[PDB]
From a paper:
Using highly enriched Pf20S purified from Pf NF54 pellets, we determined the cryo-EM structure of the TDI-8304-bound complex at an average resolution of 2.18 Å. In the Pf20S–TDI-8304 structure, in addition to two anticipated TDI-8304 molecules in the two β5 subunits, there are four unexpected TDI-8304 molecules, two in the two β2 subunits, and two in the two antechambers near the β-annulus, in a pocket formed by subunits β3, β4, and α3. The EM densities of all six TDI-8304 molecules were well resolved for unambiguous atomic modeling. No TDI-8304 density was observed in any β1 catalytic pocket, even when the EM map was displayed at a low threshold. TDI-8304 binds to the β5 subunit with the P1 cyclopentyl group projecting into the S1 pocket and the P3 morpholino group inserting into the S3 pocket. The main chain of the cyclic peptide-like inhibitor binds to the substrate cleft in an antiparallel β-sheet mode, forming an extensive hydrogen bonding network with Ser21, Gly47, and Ala49 of β5 and the side chain of Asp153 of β6. The TDI-8304 pyrrolidinone forms two hydrogen bonds with the β6 Ser154 to further enhance the affinity. Importantly, TDI-8304 also makes extensive contact with several hydrophobic residues including Ala20, Met22, Met45, Gly48, and Ala49 of β5 and Phe135, Val155, and Cys159 of β6. The P5 pyrrolidinone has only a weak hydrogen bonding with β2 Glu22, as compared to the strong hydrophobic interactions with β5 Met22 and Phe135 and two hydrogen bonds with β6 Ser154 in the β5/β6 site. The macrocyclic ring of TDI-8304 fits snugly in an alcove formed by the α3, β3, and β4 subunits, with the P1 cyclopentyl and P3 morpholino groups partially exposed to the solvent in the antechamber.
The proteasome of the malaria parasite Plasmodium falciparum (Pf20S) is an advantageous drug target because its inhibition kills P. falciparum in multiple stages of its life cycle and synergizes with artemisinins. The 20S proteasome core particle is composed of two antechambers located between an α-ring and a β-ring and a catalytic chamber centrally located between two β-rings. Unfolded peptide substrates must pass through the antechamber before reaching the catalytic chamber for degradation. We recently developed a macrocyclic peptide, TDI-8304, that is highly selective for Pf20S over human proteasomes and is potent in vitro and in vivo against P. falciparum.
Numbering used by the authors:
A (entry chain a): 26 to 240
B (entry chain Z): 1 to 211
C (entry chain b): 2 to 138, 147 to 265
D (entry chain K): 1 to 195
E (entry chain H), H (entry chain V): 1 to 82, 89 to 252
F (entry chain J): 2 to 119, 127 to 218
G (entry chain I): 1 to 221
The structure:
């Protein structure tokens, strides 16, 4: 006979977020993999939702694309119906309900919402596949998350250090994001090729790239 | 997860930890496990994070509509019945929800436990989550309805601490809210259990504590 | 469909200086049985778009029907050449069909390649479309098409979709793709593109049991979609060690 | 389920268990005696699990330790006894396992009062306090909260009473009959407690 | 895999494809499925590669033991005093491959040392000990074998050792492997008793070619072994493509 | 898989200049979420130049440690010398493989000094194993246990070549603590042993107890 | 894993990547996959790491024993027989896919051995998760009678194909050339993968930043 | 089951065995696997009997609907005015059965009513609606069909509707059923373009005979339908035994 087809596949990759006082960094590698082969070395995981809000996801690429496009559609409809752009918090709740609407046949997507609210606070929300979400100062989804989250805990919170550091700034935070993603690339077979680093601050959204290892 | 609540002579104490887990990996240590249902009703979250969050927010919406329509405050019993019916409708679907609803209404202070299987149990003292047996043992050992606010808060904190000490699923921060006739107060917004261990079990801090 | 029964193996599509070159052997197998040896696996969608498939033949024929009628309706509403659907449009449509079927657990058991020319500025073919006549089979020359104006998309069973300068399906995702990632380059001539595709197909013939050496090449260029004459690929073994008789080796031990 | 509790202090060790013998849905006895295995030389093995496995493993351990002590005309050290027990359980784990949980207690001049906690997989560690069974979930936090070094025997018995009241009140099986073994001052005493 | 044996007037011919695959992947393009057991005794392997290889190694050892035990004491034959060659090069000629690789050994021929067949094990004996080995472990072993050889008693012979460890002697032809099902009726229709060397060679080659054409599990090149009373000839054919007028 | 989650725990090895460090969590879990002990060391001294860290199933940890102690003691009494760390590492590999099909559910590391006798030079030596004895010789760090991914991230990010004993202690302790803070079934204390040719420093860290 | 070998003029050349994985995590970034069997026989291993380590060690030591007892140059055929018989005995549960190469009285030989016990004498082959990519390159570019430098370049290109196209492969490229008179193990031969981004200054924790509960110093000798 | 179709110079011939079996038991000795859809359109059935029967019944209904919708209004062809016999009796002669049953109708021939092919559905249309029906329910339906027929546009045609609901047009021959695997290469070797009626008849008969010889699932008798532009001929052959010189 024929076995029942499984509707899920992990296409790999990592998304990393880090808030500041007035900025948020969201970075993601661009590899797209299938089992132990590479579909393509350039498949961006971050989509722009608003001038002040982006979304980055890891998991099944078809699900991520559909969910990003659905969220963009819903947000444009919201703008037309209500005359204003939704804040990051509104989008966070909307994404929660969208994910939970499939509670019993979930999207295979782990999503980080990054943006700056009206008060110019850097904001991060990170999600599970069924809609659970929480606000955080740094987060990471995808194959490399269990490698990266300890590093950012150590650097940002410093809970286990008596002599602490309190000099945080955008350049150092970006350097930390780059080191975290490179260290993850060192050990996670599904993270590599190239990373896009998005920075949101007062002016708006800015994009830069960093090369990762190819093996 | 460890959540608990109990009645005492000045109202209801509600205490929770703040850890969220994905398998054995700690997803967060700052989640908020006490959800304001309305001005006078608090809900605690145990079990699935999405299920608890969604259905307690849905209950909040239902109660808002009810209290607009009828120009009166819903009772804790009615809120718990609504939630239990909604959850029972999803029986067999695999919802994971352990919820304690506490509040004040015209019938006084009330407390109900509601789980995904449709269970709805009125009571004066509850605990849910992986760490709930430890909280239960501590509370039952040291529970008196005539405790003052300070004693009640201290007992809730100690129970949460012991639960997080013995249960790998519980930890992070302890939050202790107080529900009274005119709403609720956050007595302890969030206190790392790290300090609690070296305050209760090993104040000397000169060698590793031995269970 | 519950699983593959009659299957085609692998397709290769690459951009070169005059458009798209897509290739597939003309074989459909019933398990390990090579029942059909003259099967068309690359279909014309419109004058600028082609569809290649691997996997189940019945699902591929279904999808080809869908796209044929989609192009027909497109032509029914056309008022100017710009209105014709691009390869990107068809790739989006196919990715959507696959996503919807995944959500029902009712997928088409195919991997699909949608390739073509994503511009209308290189010719006037879509000004008077002929569905049932071909004029290419006059003495004009190909126009070089900027790579950015060319499109090669991929869709798999789960709805995974992406575009690239070269796309492979099936065993070409290992054998052909390795050589392409090593050796493909922009603005290749038809000769160089054909040579590289033929090297990939030769490796596939030597290493893929489902493959054959009867190759159909299709080109999408300023002249439209052209089906080349099918041809047998000459594949000779690359070592005399294979042909050495076994009796000339030592009779003792595991000599085989 | 068989609830086992152990508490060691500077000057004592106390073990306690429910006294129920269970056959499916009925209590064969309210005064079970197949859990405690007193061993010559201020040692005690306390076992939970199936009665048959309990009897087999416990009597095997007791007989082998008595044999050792008769052959070498000396008392086995408590730590040696604990690791011999663990090793035998681990030998049978991959061949024909004894599904039994153990608390091992004793006194000797070399190490004072010792308590070892061992589970049915033969995972063992020395502990100051420990419990086995489903009632462990309900007594462990009480043990943690009320234990301190320099605890007296009477204080430890009061802690055990707290544990028994919690088991009676909150545990699904309302256990109200208990037996305790108290080791201190070079003597082993037996007590029975009803809550 | 396709393995064939055909008895003709003056010998027995064994042919095979050379493809070994694991699924749809071809792990070995040109394996060697026709293996010498003794100077006049060959076996064609089918089934799982590890199984047939280890079985054949064991059988070769057994055959050495039997042969050396068959040696009689003394001297013998103090007086006893003991065909049109296949144009292999023309079979293997292709227009697009002419001197493209000049160095290519496609043929070999050798003569029997045991000229009178004084000690060479009987084909039947080796085949039956193989059947015994396969049958004793037929709960695990999955491989089908064709034995071909020449002995002074029964002359040229074919023995099919089938899956599960049964043995059948064939007096015309034997076929095995997933590819032979396709050429079953072709061979049945084209075979006749007392064929010449040339007819047998052409027939066995065409059988393998058709099987490779129709079976994905078969392919590569073709190895043909011809076993006569005095010599063994081996050929490799690399012109395997099939041309249909239609 | 879940067998390793039954108890939890992890071990970490790191080398500096003429020094090497081995660290472990102190928890003994049961049923993956119940903490039954907070002094269950995974670090064992074979001889002055050879330590082993054993994470995994506690019964198998104790059993394997006893086997290794037996073998090392016999070897050293027969030879009248301390066992070289590489001989011990190969022996551990062979012992684990001897159970190839019913293995000990252990995730060992070996940390110590390779002595190059001219005067004597002390070269740090580190090796990580799987449960059937595959070996990974390294110069910077080794990890094992259910916390392996977090330790790998922390080490890849923070390890610094050629640190002195104090720098080595701070680095390995920070790596271990950060990794443990993200694990539900590991922690409840950390022991850190910093080795030099002259002395061993044993420290217990003021770590999280939840 | 990507291992490969080919036959060239009076020499056998083996090549391997150096990644070992434990699930999706890279466990060893510089593991050795080329194994010395004898001065004239090497082998490359793919599959279960422990099985490969112990099978190749057993083979090496038995081969040395045989050489001492017979005082003759070891044969590649002997390694094939011994290895295949062992692997067959374990019915593929010893997951050892091995490319065995060497030079002896019968000239340069190369064998592809599979975990179930089959073997095949070949001019070239690749094994492991990356074997399809390496085989693409080798099929494209292999030739009879290559020089040793050409063979080394081709082996390196094949291993690199595996390294860059298969997630289970990575690290450096190791090569060994085995002739009649000696071998040459080059490790690393390529080194195509290194860390790209480094932080501008390595984090050095100030002394005393980590809180401690107890500390004891114990001197040695 | 063996079903075959072969295109020859002046028509298309369809042949089949007649055995239907339930395991090793033959439930129907002589089924009828070649069924008339329209006067010039036949289908050869393979696979599960219930599936192919109910599919063909549905298709016959659809074909009646199509045909009557194809009828144009008015009158046409107010002026338009529109081979070696098969010695079936000698094919069917057996020494041991001579007048043993005199009453035996082994042949039938009829002429098309729609002489100009004014309204008969195209072979391709009927084949494709069948493919549609099979594909829509290919999770449950297991049956492979061969369509043969003649229309004024494409002349004699063969369409293979394969399992899972794919359709391929064949321009030389089509084979299906468990028995055809055995005659694959025999037919490939013996087929040529533009065969005569006599050559095609002999070839298709021999193909079925060989398949019945080799396949236990095939047997019974042989039914041959010949479809030309003007008439349809049907034959039954009962001399199916195969005689080998060897
Ligand atoms: O801690 C938790 N409960 C406490 C924290 C708040 C309330 C109390 C639970 C503990 C286990 C819950 C078991 O019931 C489930 C019900 C539905 C789904 C899933 C589990 C699987 C889902 N999985 C597994 C991997 C992929 C995925 O989606 C998953 O475990 N989700 C995490 C959410 C953790 N965070 C997500 C974002 O940030 C806030 C919390 C989650 O529900 N944990
Ligand atoms: O004292 C012993 N021999 C006396 C008894 C008869 C006469 C002498 C030896 C001690 C030798 C020490 C060497 O280190 C090991 C070498 C090999 C294996 C193992 C350890 C681990 C193995 N383990 C560990 C737990 C599960 C398991 O299988 C295990 O301990 N085997 C026991 C045999 C135990 N049975 C023997 C007869 O008595 C009843 C029990 C064993 O080897 N003992
Ligand atoms: O790369 C690898 N082979 C190449 C690397 C060099 C030679 C070739 C394989 C690639 C995947 C194979 C996994 O199939 C197994 C089947 C049975 C047993 C085990 C593994 C054992 C074990 N398992 C199984 C899951 C739990 C566990 O632990 C495990 O995965 N071993 C890892 C290496 C382990 N580490 C040892 C020391 O550090 C380096 C790596 C391993 O063999 N990987």
């Amino acid at each position: 006979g024929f076995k029942r087809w499984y509707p899920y596949i992990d296409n790999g990759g990592t998304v990393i977020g880090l808030t500041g006082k007035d900025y948020v960094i969201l970075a993601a590698d661009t590899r797209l993999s299938l089992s132990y082969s590479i579909y393509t070395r350039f498949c961006p995981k971050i989509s722009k939702l608003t001038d002040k809000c982006i979304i980055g996801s890891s998991g099944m690429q078809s699900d991520i694309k559909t969910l990003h496009s659905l969220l963009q559609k819903k947000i444009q409809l919201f703008v037309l119906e209500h005359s204003h752009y939704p804040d990051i918090h509104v989008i966070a709740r909307l994404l929660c309900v969208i994910l939970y609407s499939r509670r019993f046949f979930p999207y295979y997507a782990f999503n980080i919402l990054a943006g700056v609210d009206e008060n110019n606070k850097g904001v991060l929300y990170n999600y599970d596949s069924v809609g659970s979400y929480c606000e955080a100062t740094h987060s990471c989804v995808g194959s490399g998350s269990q490698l990266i989250l300890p590093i950012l805990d150590n650097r940002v919170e410093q809970k286990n250090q008596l002599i602490k550091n309190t000099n945080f700034n955008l350049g150092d935070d970006i350097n930390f994001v780059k080191d975290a993603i490179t260290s993850a690339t060192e050990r996670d077979i599904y993270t590599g090729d190239k990373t896009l680093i998005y920075v949101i601050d007062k002016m708006g959204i800015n994009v830069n790239t960093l090369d990762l290892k190819q093996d | 997860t460890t959540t608990l609540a109990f009645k005492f002579k000045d109202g209801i104490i509600v205490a929770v930890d703040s850890r969220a887990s994905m398998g054995s990996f700690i997803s967060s240590q700052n989640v908020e496990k006490i959800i304001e249902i309305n001005k006078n009703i608090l809900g605690t979250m145990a079990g699935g994070a999405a299920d608890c969050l969604y259905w307690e927010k849905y209950l909040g919406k239902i109660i808002k509509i009810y209290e607009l329509r009828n120009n009166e405050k819903i009772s804790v019993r009615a809120a718990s019945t609504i939630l239990s019916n909604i959850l029972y409708q999803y029986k067999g679907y695999g919802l994971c929800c352990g919820i304690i609803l506490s509040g004040y209404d015209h019938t006084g202070f009330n407390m109900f436990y509601v789980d995904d299987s449709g269970k709805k149990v009125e009571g004066n003292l509850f605990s849910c989550g992986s760490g709930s047996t430890y909280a239960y043992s501590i509370l039952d050992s040291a529970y008196d309805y005539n405790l003052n606010l300070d004693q009640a808060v201290e007992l809730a904190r100690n129970a949460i601490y012991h639960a997080t000490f013995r249960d790998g699923g519980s930890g992070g921060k302890v939050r202790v809210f107080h529900i009274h006739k005119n709403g609720y107060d956050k007595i302890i917004e969030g206190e790392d259990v790290f300090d609690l261990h070296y305050h209760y079990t090993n104040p000397e801090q000169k060698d590793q504590y031995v269970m | 469909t519950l699983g593959p029964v009659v299957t085609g193996t692998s397709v290769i599509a690459i951009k070169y200086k005059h458009g798209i070159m897509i290739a597939a052997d003309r074989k459909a197998s019933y398990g390990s049985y090579a029942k059909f040896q003259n099967v068309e696996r690359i279909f014309k969608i419109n004058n600028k778009t082609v569809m290649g498939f691997s996997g189940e033949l019945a699902d591929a024929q279904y999808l080809h029907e869908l796209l044929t009628r989609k192009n027909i309706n497109n032509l029914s509403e056309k008022k100017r050449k710009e209105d014709m659907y691009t390869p990107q449009h068809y790739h989006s449509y196919v990715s959507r069909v696959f996503y919807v079927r995944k959500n029902r657990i009712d997928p088409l058991f195919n991997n699909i390649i949608i390739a073509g020319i994503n511009s209308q500025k290189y010719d006037n073919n879509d000004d008077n479309v002929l569905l049932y006549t071909n004029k290419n089979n006059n003495n004009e020359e190909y126009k070089e098409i900027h790579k950015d104006d060319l499109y090669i998309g991929f869709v798999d069973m789960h709805g995974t979709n992406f575009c690239d300068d070269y796309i492979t399906t099936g065993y070409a995702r290992y054998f052909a793709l390795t050589l392409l990632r090593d050796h493909y380059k922009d603005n290749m001539t038809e000769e160089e593109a054909r040579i590289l595709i033929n090297e990939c197909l030769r490796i596939l013939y030597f290493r893929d049991a489902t493959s054959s050496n009867f190759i159909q090449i299709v080109k999408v260029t300023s002249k439209g979609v052209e089906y080349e004459e099918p041809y047998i690929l000459p594949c000779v073994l690359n070592s005399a060690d294979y042909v050495y008789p076994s009796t000339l080796l030592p009779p003792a031990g595991c000599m085989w | 389920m068989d609830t086992l509790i152990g508490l060691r202090g500077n000057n004592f060790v106390v073990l306690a268990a429910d006294t129920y013998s269970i056959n499916s849905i009925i209590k064969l006895k309210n005064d079970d005696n197949t859990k405690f295995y007193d061993i010559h030389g201020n040692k005690c093995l306390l076992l939970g699990g199936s009665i048959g496995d309990r009897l087999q493993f416990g009597e095997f351990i007791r007989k082998n330790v008595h044999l050792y002590q008769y052959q070498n005309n000396t008392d086995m050290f408590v730590k040696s006894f604990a690791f011999f027990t663990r090793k035998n359980l681990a030998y049978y784990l991959r061949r024909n396992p004894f599904e039994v949980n153990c608390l091992i207690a004793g006194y000797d001049k070399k190490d004072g009062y010792q308590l070892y906690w061992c589970d049915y997989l033969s995972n063992m560690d020395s502990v100051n306090k420990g419990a086995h069974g489903y009632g462990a979930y309900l007594v462990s936090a009480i043990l943690d909260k009320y234990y301190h070094e320099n605890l007296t025997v009477d204080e430890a018995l009061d802690i055990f009473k707290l544990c028994f009241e919690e088991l009676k009140k909150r545990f699904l099986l309302t256990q109200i009959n208990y037996e305790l073994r108290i080791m201190y001052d070079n003597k082993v005493e037996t007590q029975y407690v009803t809550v | 895999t396709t393995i064939i044996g055909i008895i003709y007037d003056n010998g027995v011919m064994l042919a095979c494809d050379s493809r070994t695959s694991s699924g749809t992947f071809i792990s070995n393009k040109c394996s060697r499925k026709i293996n010498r057991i003794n100077e006049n005794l060959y076996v064609c392997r089918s089934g799982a590669s590890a199984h047939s290889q280890k079985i054949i190694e064991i059988i070769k050892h057994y055959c050495v033991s039997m042969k050396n035990e068959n040696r009689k004491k003394g001297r013998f034959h103090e007086g006893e005093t003991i065909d049109e060659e296949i144009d292999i090069d023309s079979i293997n000629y292709l227009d697009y491959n002419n001197n493209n690789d000049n160095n290519l050994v496609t043929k070999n021929k050798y003569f029997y040392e045991d000229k009178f067949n004084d000690y060479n094990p009987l084909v039947e004996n080796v085949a039956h000990i193989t059947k015994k080995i396969i049958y004793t472990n037929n709960n695990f072993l999955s491989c089908a074998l064709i034995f071909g050889g020449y002995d002074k008693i029964k002359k040229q012979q074919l023995y099919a050792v089938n899956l599960n460890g049964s043995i059948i002697e064939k007096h015309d032809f034997a076929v095995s492997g997933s590819g032979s099902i396709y050429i079953q009726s072709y061979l049945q229709d084209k075979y006749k008793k007392f064929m010449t060397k040339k007819e047998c060679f052409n027939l066995i080659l065409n059988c393998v070619k058709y099987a490779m054409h129709n079976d994905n599990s078969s392919g590569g090149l073709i190895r043909i072994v011809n076993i006569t009373k005095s010599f063994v000839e081996e050929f490799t054919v690399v012109n395997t493509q099939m041309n249909f007028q239609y | 898989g879940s067998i390793y989650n039954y108890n939890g725990g992890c071990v970490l090895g790191m080398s500096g200049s003429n020094c090497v460090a081995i660290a472990c969590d102190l928890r003994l879990g049961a049923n993956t979420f119940t903490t039954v002990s907070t002094k269950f060391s995974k670090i064992f001294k074979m001889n002055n130049n050879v330590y082993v860290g054993l994470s995994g199933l506690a019964t198998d940890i104790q059993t394997l440690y006893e086997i290794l102690r037996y073998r090392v003691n016999l070897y050293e009494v027969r030879q009248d010398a301390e066992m070289d760390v590489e001989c011990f590492a190969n022996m551990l590999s062979s012992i684990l493989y001897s159970n190839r099909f019913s293995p000990y559910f252990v995730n060992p590391i070996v940390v110590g000094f390779k002595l190059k006798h001219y005067k004597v030079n002390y070269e740090p030596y580190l090796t990580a194993y799987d449960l059937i004895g595959a070996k990974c010789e390294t110069r910077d760090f080794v990890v094992n246990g259910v916390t392996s991914e977090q330790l790998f991230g922390m080490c890849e990010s923070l390890y610094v070549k050629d640190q002195d004993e104090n720098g080595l202690f701070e680095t390995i302790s920070q790596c271990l603590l950060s990794a443990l803070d993200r694990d539900c079934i590991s922690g409840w204390g950390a022991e850190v042993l910093v080795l030099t040719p002259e002395k061993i420093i044993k420290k217990k860290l003021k770590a999280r107890m939840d | 894993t990507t291992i490969c070998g080919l036959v060239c003029q009076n020499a056998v050349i083996l090549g391997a990547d150096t990644r070992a994985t434990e699930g999706p995590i890279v466990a060893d970034k510089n593991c050795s996959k080329l194994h010395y069997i004898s001065k004239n026989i090497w082998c490359a291993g793919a599959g279960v790491a422990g099985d490969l380590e112990h099978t190749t060690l057993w083979l090496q030591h038995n081969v040395e024993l045989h050489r001492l007892n017979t005082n003759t140059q070891p044969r590649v055929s002997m390694c094939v027989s011994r290895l295949t018989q062992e692997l067959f005995k374990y019915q593929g549960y010893k997951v050892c896919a091995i490319v065995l190469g060497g030079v002896d009285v019968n000239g340069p030989q190369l064998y592809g051995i599979h975990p179930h016990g089959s073997s095949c004498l070949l001019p070239f082959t690749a094994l492991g998760s990356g074997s399809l990519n390496a085989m693409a390159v080798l099929e494209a570019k292999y030739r009879d009678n290559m020089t040793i430098e050409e063979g080394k370049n081709l082996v390196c290109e094949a291993i690199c194909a595996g390294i860059f196209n298969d997630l289970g492969s990575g690290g450096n490229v190791d090569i060994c050339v085995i002739t009649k008179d000696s071998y040459q193990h080059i490790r690393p031969y390529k080194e195509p993968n290194m860390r790209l981004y480094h932080l501008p200054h390595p984090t050095i924790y100030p002394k005393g930043t980590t809180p401690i509960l107890s500390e004891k110093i114990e001197y040695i000798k």
